């Protein structure tokens, strides 16, 4: 009743969207592929596909 | 004269701190042993009922029959 | 066991009993117990015994 | 398939152990709501006794 | 059975033993730097290790890559020999607008290429050298790694007042300009020794944690390895208030530091800090603080029959 | 230094209902088992049901 | 003067390839023979 | 660095030893013990006057 | 072994049994005749949650100030019945038959399981004393630590908390009192009494025949003048009385007792008066005693103790700290309620206080032997027998405690107590080295008991004054100053 507790930071929601694309983005560094021997089969259309480059 | 709040120890006073390492570490020395054994119990190992099988491996635990 | 001040500790407050002439007497004298077990001890409190401290030694007499 | 089944399944297991303590909370901790205020204490190096009075 | 004259060699040899201590434990093991122990670091590279012996590596503008040349991309790590030194090179921030390829002999250089390094033609070789990095050719910046300053405690004054006196008197040899309470004087010596050696032996009791913590980073700095829980031991007291925490069975922690200690409050960081200088205990005498309301409670009739009391009594002990 | 967690299992599981949890939820199921699933299911008279 | 049973330098060395496990470790290095060689894929197959 | 570049050079050699840093350790028992020597003193340096008041 | 050497006098051991039984029966019958003429009714009194009883010295643990006994003989008194709970496990044959007789070896084989009558020592202090440092000093020496932790625990609580139980003002006290085996530093026992400032106010309402009114130092210091002056009962009551309708006036004034505003207790206004029964405007039904007028206030003899121990109540204790607290003062702890222990506490407690009584009837602690000294200590649990002290700490000691003891709370006691027993041990051989200052010495002198202390902030400790150096202090210290000096 009536305690007053001040507002705690670690009980915030800051981080954890950073801290997962942070992750997403250390598994994304490891596609930076060099131009030599790179090939890929687009689309008819001549778009990319979606699995091939990853 | 002795310094205080010191003595020596006791049976009562629990092993030291290496001994409690060892026995932290084995489980740990453990897994390495019980995970193949997994591995081998689960693939070496016959189902135990078939369409043909007129009988069933049965365990007698206490020997009563 | 007898006494409402204790028999009561459950539902009423203590206040109630601190305060001379909340309860009337005719109020308290409901409010004890009647059962044979209260009169029993009602009886034995003018008997001679042999007390013990409330314990472990008073209930395995028991 | 890899990341759908784990994404959802972790979801789940989210789902559930967040609403079992919600519920934990709503449904059998409320009971044990006390809250005591802090009174100041004056007699702390002398106490009133039996021995007092009697 | 103790003079007082005695209480300084004391401290002398207590100072003795915590030096050796400290000196000790002054010093701490650095970062390792066997490559052993960080191979896997260039093992988990986004790109294949280059063991570059031969050639060159050069930098020219982006674009197309010569057909023959390996890029050497950001995150590209190179195993090679600089200066008899094996070493790994890691590539990090290459320039906008160029990039920077290893051209084995067998590849022709484009135009506008600059050779970063090179190596000698040495195909007999079984043990190849490497390379030669001039003065000029590659700046290679060490740390700087400046040593703050060693972090002092303060030391409290003490105000002697008799040296000046026992100037005066070698000087003539009254001496003082006042008359001493001998009473009141013995008194405060009497209660102020028992303070010093109580307090020594307290030193005494904590300098036994510090040459027993010393005695454990004396193998540390051996090489040796100590077990998280035979250093434990080495720290008695610690030991015992954590194997009490673990029969407890609460891992929890951070607001007791924080409710104890409330200078670290807020501080997440605060086992990571020596904050003792920013909060040490207050030199205020609470003895003026008693005095101040044993003045105040008594009239000034009492305060000048003080000086009554106090000059019979010189001629008490004058007859 | 004496503490139950190196020197007397009995105390350390007395002092802990977390220690008493996983033994009453041991005992649950095996009344459940007694209770319900033992006479309906693992009875020889009650096996066939398992076709 | 140590009076505990103190441990050699080679024994240390030995646990410290035990009780340096991380979870990944386990978790692929036994999940891979595991997913292989169960139910799913080969033991599975058969033994159905 | 270099013109256009810049690296991380790692050397490649076994540790035999450990390598130390001398970062001293704050510590109050020095100047707790020398607060003590300086009050005796001030006690001694008392005691000596008062002999020779009392005596000389 | 020791089952043979126990069971060659086992034999010899009943006869002193028997005749141990009949001297605690004389003792008890002169202790209970007394009691039942002089001392008070004791209400039993159920825990909040009214399933047990609850247990408090301050109305349970009486002193017969006044008891015509030697020290010597409460001593005995207390360690017989002491020995009539060691012969406990004689029942074992009779309840589960010849074959429970192995039980009956097991408590052959340890001389610390058995009474006195199995001791080959004469007087009672040698006995207890040997019992001690047999079997009792070792079974203290390994609860103390965790007793310790536990009442930290108590009033830290569990699972990161601090913030919302423990107080800020009492954090360097707590230090001091929780934490000095790693300073080396002496205690204050007034810093464990700053504990009691997790607690509220304790109260005492005297029963009156229109009201309850609280009791004051006024008050109280104006029932004790009365009862020196030796007046005759018609001028006593009446001054009694007059000094009670003050401090009701007192206490109307300031805004009724501390107790009406206070969670957990209160006293009920006047009752309602429900629908028709209303009266217009008067919504109430005062009391009977609203008719008696206020001239006619007297004491009906009953008083109300209301600790207000919000955090340091013996029932929110739990199962653990209880049989820990009774493991530690060498009590029994096993197979019982809370409330059973806390009984066993509290005579403990009452115990101690008597025989504190009796000593300071005896000429003080200064007219005790060494080993009589050694073993008051040792049923304080201040002393463990591997210390080896002096004579002047060993008074201070005591001072200590029974001050301590004379506040009527368990919770300070222990935690001064179990400070006493933070002993560790050093994995070396040459470390600890061999001390260079002589033993630890004390005076009675030295104990600040006669003087508050208000509690140090927190961060910002204040060292330590002696009383010697307070004013006046050869006039307050003079019957400590003649007692020494004799
Ligand atoms: C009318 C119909 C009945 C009405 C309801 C009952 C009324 C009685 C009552 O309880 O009122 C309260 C009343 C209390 O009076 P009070 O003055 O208001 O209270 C004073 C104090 O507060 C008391 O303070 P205290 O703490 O000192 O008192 C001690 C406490 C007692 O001390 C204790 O603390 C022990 C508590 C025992 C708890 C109950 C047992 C529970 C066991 C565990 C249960 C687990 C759950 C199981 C369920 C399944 C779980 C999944 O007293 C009691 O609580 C009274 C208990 C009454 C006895 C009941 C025994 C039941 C045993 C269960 C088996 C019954 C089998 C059937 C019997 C035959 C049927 C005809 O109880 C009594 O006084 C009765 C006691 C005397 C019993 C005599 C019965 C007559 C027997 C005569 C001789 C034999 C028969 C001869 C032939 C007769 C012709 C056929
Ligand atoms: C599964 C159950 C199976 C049962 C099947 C049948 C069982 C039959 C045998 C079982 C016998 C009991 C076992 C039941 C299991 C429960 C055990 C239990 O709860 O007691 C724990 C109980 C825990 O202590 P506590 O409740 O905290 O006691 C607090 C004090 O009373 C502090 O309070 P205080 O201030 O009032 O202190 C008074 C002081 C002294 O009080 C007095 O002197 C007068 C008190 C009035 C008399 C009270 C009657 C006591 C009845 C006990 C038996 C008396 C004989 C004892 C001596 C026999 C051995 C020489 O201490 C005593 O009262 C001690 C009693 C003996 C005093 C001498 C009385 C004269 C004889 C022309 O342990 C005891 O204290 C028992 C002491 C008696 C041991 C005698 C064993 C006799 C073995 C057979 C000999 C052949
Ligand atoms: C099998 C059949 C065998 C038949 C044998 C019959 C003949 C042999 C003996 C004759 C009986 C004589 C009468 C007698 O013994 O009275 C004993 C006893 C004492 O009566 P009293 O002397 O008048 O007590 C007065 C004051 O309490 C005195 O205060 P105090 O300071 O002296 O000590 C008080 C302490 C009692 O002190 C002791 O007696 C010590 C006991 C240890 C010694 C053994 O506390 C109590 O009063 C116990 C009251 C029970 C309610 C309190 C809450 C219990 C919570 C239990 C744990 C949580 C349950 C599971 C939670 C999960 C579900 C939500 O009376 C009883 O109430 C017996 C109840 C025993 C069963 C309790 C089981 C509770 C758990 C049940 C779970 C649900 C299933 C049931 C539905
Ligand atoms: C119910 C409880 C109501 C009253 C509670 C008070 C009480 O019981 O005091 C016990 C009391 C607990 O100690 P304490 O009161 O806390 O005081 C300890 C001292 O401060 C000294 O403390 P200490 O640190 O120096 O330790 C002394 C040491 C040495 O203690 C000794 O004095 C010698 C050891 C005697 C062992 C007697 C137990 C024998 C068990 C049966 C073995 C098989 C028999 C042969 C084959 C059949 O203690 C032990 O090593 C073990 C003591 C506990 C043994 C278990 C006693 C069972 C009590 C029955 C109620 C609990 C079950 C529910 O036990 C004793 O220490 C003396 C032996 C008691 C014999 C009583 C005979 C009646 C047994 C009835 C069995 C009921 C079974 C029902 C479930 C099945
Ligand atoms: C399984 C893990 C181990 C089991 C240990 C449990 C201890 C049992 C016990 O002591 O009961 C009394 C104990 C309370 O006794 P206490 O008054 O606090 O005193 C503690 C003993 O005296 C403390 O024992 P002690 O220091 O007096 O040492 C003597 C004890 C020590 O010996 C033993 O207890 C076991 C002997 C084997 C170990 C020996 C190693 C050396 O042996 C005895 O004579 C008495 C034990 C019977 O009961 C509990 O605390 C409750 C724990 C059990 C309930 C957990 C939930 C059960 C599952 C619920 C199913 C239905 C739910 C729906
Ligand atoms: C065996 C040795 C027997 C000798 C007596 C044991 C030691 C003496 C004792 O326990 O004190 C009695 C105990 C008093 O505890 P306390 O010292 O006052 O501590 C209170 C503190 O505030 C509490 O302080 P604390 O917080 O530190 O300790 C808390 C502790 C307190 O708990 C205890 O008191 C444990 C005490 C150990 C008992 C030993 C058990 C050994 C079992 C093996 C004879 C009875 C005949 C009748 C049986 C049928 C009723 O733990 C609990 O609160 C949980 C207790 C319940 C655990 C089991 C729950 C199972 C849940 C199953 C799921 C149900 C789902 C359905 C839901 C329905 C929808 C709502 O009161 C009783 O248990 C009843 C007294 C009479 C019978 C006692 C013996 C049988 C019942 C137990
Ligand atoms: C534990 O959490 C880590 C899980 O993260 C998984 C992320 O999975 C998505 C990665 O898949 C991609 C997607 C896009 C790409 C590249 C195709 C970024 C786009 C590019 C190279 C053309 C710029 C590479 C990989």
């Given at each position: 009743?009536?305690?007053?507790?001040?507002?705690?930071?670690?009980?915030?929601?800051?981080?954890?969207?950073?801290?997962?694309?942070?992750?997403?983005?250390?598994?994304?560094?490891?596609?930076?592929?060099?131009?030599?021997?790179?090939?890929?089969?687009?689309?008819?259309?001549?778009?990319?596909?979606?699995?091939?480059?990853? | 004269?002795?310094?205080?709040?010191?003595?020596?120890?006791?049976?009562?006073?629990?092993?030291?701190?290496?001994?409690?390492?060892?026995?932290?570490?084995?489980?740990?020395?453990?897994?390495?042993?019980?995970?193949?054994?997994?591995?081998?119990?689960?693939?070496?190992?016959?189902?135990?009922?078939?369409?043909?099988?007129?009988?069933?491996?049965?365990?007698?635990?206490?020997?009563?029959? | 066991?007898?006494?409402?001040?204790?028999?009561?500790?459950?539902?009423?407050?203590?206040?109630?009993?601190?305060?001379?002439?909340?309860?009337?007497?005719?109020?308290?004298?409901?409010?004890?117990?009647?059962?044979?077990?209260?009169?029993?001890?009602?009886?034995?409190?003018?008997?001679?015994?042999?007390?013990?401290?409330?314990?472990?030694?008073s209930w395995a007499c028991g | 398939l890899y990341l759908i089944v784990i994404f959802?399944?972790?979801?789940?297991?989210?789902?559930?152990?967040?609403?079992?303590?919600?519920?934990?909370?709503?449904?059998?901790?409320?009971?044990?709501?006390?809250?005591?205020?802090?009174?100041?204490?004056?007699?702390?190096?002398?106490?009133?006794?039996?021995?007092?009075?009697? | 059975?103790?003079?007082?004259?005695?209480?300084?060699?004391?401290?002398?040899?207590?100072?003795?033993?915590?030096?050796?201590?400290?000196?000790?434990?002054?010093?701490?093991?650095?970062?390792?730097?066997?490559?052993?122990?960080?191979?896997?670091?260039?093992?988990?590279?986004?790109?294949?290790?280059?063991?570059?012996?031969?050639?060159?590596?050069?930098?020219?503008?982006?674009?197309?890559?010569?057909?023959?040349?390996?890029?050497?991309?950001?995150?590209?790590?190179?195993?090679?020999?600089?200066?008899?030194?094996?070493?790994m090179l890691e590539i990090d921030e290459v320039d906008p607008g160029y990039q920077?390829?290893?051209?084995?002999?067998?590849?022709?250089?484009?135009?506008?290429?600059?050779?970063?390094?090179?190596?000698?033609?040495?195909?007999?070789?079984?043990?190849?050298?490497?390379?030669?990095?001039?003065?000029?050719?590659?700046?290679?910046?060490?740390?700087?790694?400046?040593?703050?300053?060693?972090?002092?405690?303060?030391?409290?004054?003490?105000?002697?007042?008799?040296?000046?006196?026992?100037?005066?008197?070698?000087?003539?040899?009254?001496?003082?300009?006042?008359?001493?309470?001998?009473?009141?004087?013995?008194?405060?010596?009497?209660?102020?020794?028992?303070?010093?050696?109580?307090?020594?032996?307290?030193?005494?009791?904590?300098?036994?944690?510090?040459?027993?913590?010393?005695?454990?980073?004396?193998?540390?700095?051996?090489?040796?390895?100590?077990?998280?829980?035979?250093?434990?031991?080495?720290?008695?007291?610690?030991?015992?208030?954590?194997?009490?925490?673990?029969?407890?069975?609460?891992?929890?922690?951070?607001?007791?530091?924080?409710?104890?200690?409330?200078?670290?409050?807020?501080?997440?960081?605060?086992?990571?800090?020596?904050?003792?200088?920013?909060?040490?205990?207050?030199?205020?005498?609470?003895?003026?603080?008693?005095?101040?309301?044993?003045?105040?409670?008594?009239?000034?009739?009492?305060?000048?029959?003080?000086?009554?009391?106090?000059?019979?009594?010189?001629?008490?002990?004058?007859? | 230094?004496?503490?139950?967690?190196?020197?007397?299992?009995?105390?350390?599981?007395?002092?802990?209902?977390?220690?008493?949890?996983?033994?009453?939820?041991?005992?649950?199921?095996?009344?459940?088992?007694?209770?319900?699933?033992?006479?309906?299911?693992?009875?020889?008279?009650?096996?066939?049901?398992?076709? | 003067?140590?009076?505990?049973?103190?441990?050699?330098?080679?024994?240390?060395?030995?646990?410290?390839?035990?009780?340096?496990?991380?979870?990944?470790?386990?978790?692929?290095?036994?999940?891979?023979?595991?997913?292989?060689?169960?139910?799913?894929?080969?033991?599975?197959?058969?033994?159905? | 660095?270099?013109?256009?570049?810049?690296?991380?050079?790692?050397?490649?050699?076994?540790?035999?030893?450990?390598?130390?840093?001398?970062?001293?350790?704050?510590?109050?028992?020095?100047?707790?013990?020398?607060?003590?020597?300086?009050?005796?003193?001030?006690?001694?340096?008392?005691?000596?006057?008062?002999?020779?008041?009392?005596?000389? | 072994?020791?089952?043979?050497?126990?069971?060659?006098?086992?034999?010899?051991?009943?006869?002193?049994?028997?005749?141990?039984?009949?001297?605690?029966?004389?003792?008890?019958?002169?202790?209970?005749?007394?009691?039942?003429?002089?001392?008070?009714?004791?209400?039993?009194?159920?825990?909040?949650?009214?399933?047990?009883?609850?247990?408090?010295?301050?109305?349970?643990?009486?002193?017969?100030?006044?008891?015509?006994?030697?020290?010597?003989?409460?001593?005995?008194?207390?360690?017989?019945?002491?020995?009539?709970?060691?012969?406990?496990?004689?029942?074992?044959?009779?309840?589960?038959?010849?074959?429970?007789?192995?039980?009956?070896?097991?408590?052959?084989?340890?001389?610390?399981?058995?009474?006195?009558?199995?001791?080959?020592?004469?007087?009672?202090?040698?006995?207890?004393?040997?019992?001690?440092?047999?079997?009792?000093?070792?079974?203290?020496?390994?609860?103390?630590?965790?007793?310790?932790?536990?009442?930290?625990?108590?009033?830290?609580?569990?699972?990161?908390?601090?913030?919302?139980?423990?107080?800020?003002?009492?954090?360097?006290?707590?230090?001091?009192?929780?934490?000095?085996?790693?300073?080396?530093?002496?205690?204050?026992?007034?810093?464990?009494?700053?504990?009691?400032?997790?607690?509220?106010?304790?109260?005492?309402?005297?029963?009156?025949?229109?009201?309850?009114?609280?009791?004051?130092?006024?008050?109280?210091?104006?029932?004790?003048?009365?009862?020196?002056?030796?007046?005759?009962?018609?001028?006593?009551?009446?001054?009694?009385?007059?000094?009670?309708?003050?401090?009701?006036?007192?206490?109307?004034?300031?805004?009724?007792?501390?107790?009406?505003?206070?969670?957990?207790?209160?006293?009920?206004?006047?009752?309602?008066?429900?629908?028709?029964?209303?009266?217009?405007?008067?919504?109430?039904?005062?009391?009977?005693?609203?008719?008696?007028?206020?001239?006619?206030?007297?004491?009906?003899?009953?008083?109300?103790?209301?600790?207000?121990?919000?955090?340091?109540?013996?029932?929110?204790?739990?199962?653990?700290?209880?049989?820990?607290?009774?493991?530690?003062?060498?009590?029994?702890?096993?197979?019982?309620?809370?409330?059973?222990?806390?009984?066993?506490?509290?005579?403990?407690?009452?115990?101690?206080?008597?025989?504190?009584?009796?000593?300071?009837?005896?000429?003080?602690?200064?007219?005790?032997?060494?080993?009589?000294?050694?073993?008051?200590?040792?049923?304080?649990?201040?002393?463990?027998?591997?210390?080896?002290?002096?004579?002047?700490?060993?008074?201070?000691?005591?001072?200590?405690?029974?001050?301590?003891?004379?506040?009527?709370?368990?919770?300070?006691?222990?935690?001064?107590?179990?400070?006493?027993?933070?002993?560790?041990?050093?994995?070396?051989?040459?470390?600890?080295?061999?001390?260079?200052?002589?033993?630890?010495?004390?005076?009675?002198?030295?104990?600040?008991?006669?003087?508050?202390?208000?509690?140090?902030?927190?961060?910002?400790?204040?060292?330590?004054?002696?009383?010697?150096?307070?004013?006046?202090?050869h006039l307050a210290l003079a019957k400590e100053v003649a007692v020494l000096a004799?």
């Amino acid at each position: 009743a009536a305690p007053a507790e001040k507002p705690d930071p670690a009980l915030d929601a800051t981080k954890a969207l950073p801290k997962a694309l942070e992750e997403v983005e250390f598994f994304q560094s490891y596609a930076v592929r060099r131009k030599t021997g790179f090939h890929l089969f687009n689309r008819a259309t001549g778009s990319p596909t979606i699995v091939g480059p990853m | 004269v002795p310094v205080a709040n010191f003595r020596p120890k006791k049976p009562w006073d629990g092993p030291w701190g290496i001994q409690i390492s060892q026995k932290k570490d084995r489980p740990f020395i453990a897994m390495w042993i019980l995970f193949p054994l997994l591995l081998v119990d689960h693939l070496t190992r016959e189902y135990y009922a078939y369409w043909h099988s007129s009988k069933v491996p049965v365990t007698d635990v206490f020997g009563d029959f | 066991k007898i006494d409402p001040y204790v028999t009561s500790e459950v539902r009423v407050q203590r206040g109630a009993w601190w305060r001379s002439g909340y309860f009337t007497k005719e109020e308290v004298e409901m409010m004890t117990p009647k059962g044979p077990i209260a009169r029993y001890y009602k009886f034995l409190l003018g008997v001679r015994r042999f007390p013990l401290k409330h314990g472990a030694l008073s209930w395995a007499c028991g | 398939l890899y990341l759908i089944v784990i994404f959802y399944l972790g979801i789940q297991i989210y789902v559930y152990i967040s609403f079992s303590l919600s519920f934990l909370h709503s449904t059998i901790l409320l009971f044990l709501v006390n809250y005591i205020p802090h009174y100041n204490n004056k007699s702390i190096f002398n106490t009133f006794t039996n021995k007092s009075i009697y | 059975d103790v003079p007082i004259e005695k209480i300084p060699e004391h401290a002398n040899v207590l100072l003795k033993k915590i030096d050796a201590c400290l000196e000790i434990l002054s010093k701490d093991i650095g970062e390792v730097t066997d490559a052993e122990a960080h191979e896997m670091y260039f093992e988990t590279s986004k790109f294949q290790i280059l063991h570059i012996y031969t050639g060159c590596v050069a930098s020219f503008p982006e674009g197309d890559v010569p057909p023959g040349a390996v890029e050497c991309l950001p995150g590209q790590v190179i195993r090679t020999k600089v200066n008899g030194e094996d070493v790994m090179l890691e590539i990090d921030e290459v320039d906008p607008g160029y990039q920077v390829c290893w051209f084995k002999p067998d590849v022709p250089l484009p135009e506008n290429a600059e050779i970063l390094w090179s190596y000698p033609y040495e195909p007999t070789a079984a043990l190849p050298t490497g390379t030669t990095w001039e003065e000029g050719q590659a700046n290679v910046l060490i740390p700087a790694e400046p040593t703050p300053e060693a972090a002092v405690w303060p030391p409290t004054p003490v105000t002697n007042v008799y040296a000046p006196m026992a100037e005066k008197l070698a000087l003539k040899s009254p001496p003082l300009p006042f008359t001493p309470d001998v009473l009141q004087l013995q008194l405060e010596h009497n209660v102020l020794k028992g303070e010093l050696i109580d307090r020594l032996r307290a030193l005494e009791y904590t300098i036994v944690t510090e040459q027993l913590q010393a005695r454990l980073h004396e193998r540390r700095l051996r090489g040796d390895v100590i077990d998280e829980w035979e250093e434990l031991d080495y720290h008695p007291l610690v030991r015992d208030d954590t194997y009490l925490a673990i029969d407890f069975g609460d891992p929890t922690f951070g607001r007791y530091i924080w409710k104890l200690f409330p200078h670290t409050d807020g501080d997440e960081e605060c086992m990571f800090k020596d904050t003792r200088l920013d909060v040490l205990p207050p030199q205020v005498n609470p003895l003026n603080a008693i005095l101040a309301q044993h003045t105040a409670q008594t009239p000034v009739h009492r305060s000048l029959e003080k000086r009554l009391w106090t000059e019979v009594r010189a001629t008490a002990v004058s007859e | 230094v004496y503490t139950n967690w190196q020197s007397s299992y009995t105390r350390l599981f007395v002092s802990k209902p977390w220690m008493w949890h996983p033994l009453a939820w041991m005992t649950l199921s095996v009344g459940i088992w007694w209770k319900f699933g033992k006479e309906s299911l693992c009875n020889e008279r009650s096996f066939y049901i398992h076709t | 003067a140590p009076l505990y049973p103190v441990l050699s330098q080679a024994s240390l060395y030995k646990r410290h390839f035990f009780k340096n496990i991380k979870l990944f470790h386990v978790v692929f290095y036994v999940g891979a023979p595991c997913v292989t060689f169960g139910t799913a894929a080969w033991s599975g197959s058969n033994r159905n | 660095l270099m013109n256009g570049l810049k690296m991380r050079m790692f050397s490649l050699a076994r540790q035999q030893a450990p390598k130390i840093v001398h970062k001293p350790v704050l510590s109050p028992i020095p100047e707790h013990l020398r607060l003590v020597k300086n009050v005796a003193q001030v006690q001694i340096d008392m005691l000596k006057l008062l002999n020779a008041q009392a005596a000389k | 072994t020791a089952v043979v050497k126990n069971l060659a006098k086992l034999p010899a051991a009943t006869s002193q049994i028997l005749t141990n039984v009949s001297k605690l029966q004389t003792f008890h019958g002169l202790l209970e005749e007394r009691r039942d003429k002089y001392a008070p009714l004791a209400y039993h009194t159920y825990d909040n949650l009214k399933q047990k009883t609850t247990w408090h010295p301050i109305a349970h643990a009486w002193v017969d100030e006044g008891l015509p006994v030697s020290k010597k003989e409460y001593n005995e008194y207390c360690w017989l019945k002491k020995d009539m709970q060691r012969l406990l496990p004689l029942a074992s044959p009779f309840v589960f038959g010849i074959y429970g007789i192995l039980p009956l070896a097991v408590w052959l084989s340890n001389d610390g399981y058995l009474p006195s009558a199995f001791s080959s020592k004469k007087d009672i202090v040698s006995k207890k004393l040997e019992w001690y440092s047999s079997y009792g000093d070792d079974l203290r020496q390994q609860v103390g630590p965790m007793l310790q932790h536990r009442l930290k625990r108590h009033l830290r609580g569990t699972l990161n908390n601090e913030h919302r139980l423990m107080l800020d003002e009492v954090t360097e006290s707590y230090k001091e009192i929780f934490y000095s085996h790693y300073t080396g530093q002496l205690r204050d026992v007034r810093k464990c009494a700053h504990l009691r400032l997790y607690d509220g106010t304790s109260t005492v309402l005297l029963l009156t025949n229109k009201e309850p009114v609280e009791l004051t130092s006024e008050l109280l210091q104006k029932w004790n003048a009365i009862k020196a002056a030796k007046l005759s009962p018609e001028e006593e009551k009446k001054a009694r009385n007059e000094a009670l309708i003050e401090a009701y006036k007192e206490q109307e004034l300031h805004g009724g007792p501390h107790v009406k505003h206070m969670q957990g207790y209160g006293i009920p206004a006047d009752t309602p008066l429900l629908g028709e029964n209303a009266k217009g405007d008067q919504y109430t039904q005062p009391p009977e005693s609203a008719s008696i007028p206020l001239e006619q206030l007297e004491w009906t003899g009953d008083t109300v103790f209301i600790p207000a121990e919000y955090r340091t109540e013996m029932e929110d204790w739990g199962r653990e700290l209880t049989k820990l607290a009774n493991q530690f003062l060498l009590l029994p702890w096993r197979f019982v309620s809370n409330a059973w222990n806390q009984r066993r506490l509290v005579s403990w407690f009452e115990e101690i206080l008597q025989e504190d009584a009796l000593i300071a009837k005896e000429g003080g602690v200064q007219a005790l032997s060494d080993d009589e000294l050694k073993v008051a200590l040792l049923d304080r649990a201040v002393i463990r027998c591997d210390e080896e002290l002096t004579r002047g700490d060993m008074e201070a000691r005591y001072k200590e405690i029974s001050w301590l003891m004379s506040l009527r709370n368990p919770f300070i006691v222990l935690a001064w107590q179990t400070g006493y027993y933070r002993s560790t041990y050093s994995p070396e051989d040459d470390l600890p080295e061999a001390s260079i200052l002589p033993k630890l010495n004390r005076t009675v002198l030295d104990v600040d008991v006669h003087n508050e202390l208000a509690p140090d902030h927190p961060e910002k400790p204040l060292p330590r004054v002696h009383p010697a150096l307070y004013p006046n202090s050869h006039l307050a210290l003079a019957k400590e100053v003649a007692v020494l000096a004799k």
